[model samples]
Target: MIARPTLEAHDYDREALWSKWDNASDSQRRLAEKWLPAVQAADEMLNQGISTKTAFATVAGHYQVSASTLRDKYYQVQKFAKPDWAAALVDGR
Candidate 1:
């Protein structure tokens, strides 16, 4: 049987989103708020073993954010999470 990946409470840090929130300009902050749930959904998919590209694209379509912007933010969150596997994952290794 294939093993499904388990999600931990710590798997994705909501603090990573909050850190960006803390630094956003007024308009950017508004945009972040508007897209917050979509972003979190993407992060949740990432935690479920979806590729970053796929998660960002899927969420971007739902949130109306540009793919590049969503991808950049996703990478930032991944970086903040600091998982040892992230480098190879991001590099497609």
Candidate 2:
């Protein structure tokens, strides 16, 4: 699991995640595959108007993983969602 502080330190940017994924060892990618579903789920929740913190907790609890882990992956998978996810949050859509 990633540390909360470190995740925040990077701003949970997708570019950072892409860098990690590109450089990941085969085994690391395999491990990441296991968490991909939870990441997608969290992204879906966020798209549906759930707060990031709430989505992370719900996805992590359901997947039996740390919130930090889910948070890290959420940013990765979120790129597939509409670009307005952040705007949605601010506009309360």
Tell me which residue pairs clash in candidate 1: none
- Measured against the true structure, the TM-scores of the candidates, in listed sequence, are 0.46, 0.47
Error of 1 at 34 (Å): 1.5
Superposed by TM-score, candidate 1 places the C-alpha of residue 77 at a distance from the truth, in angstroms, of: 4.1
* Local lDDT at 87 for model 2: 23
- What lDDT would candidate 1 get against the real structure? 0.54
Off by over 4 Å in 1: 1-28, 77-93
CA lDDT of every candidate: 0.54, 0.55
**Would you list the clashing residue pairs of candidate 2?**
none
Quick one: best TM-score, which candidate? Answer: 2
RMSD of each: 11.0, 12.3
lDDT of 2 by residue, 1-93 (tens): 232223334334755544545565666656645655565567579779998778777776678889985565456445533332322222211
Clashes of each: 0, 0
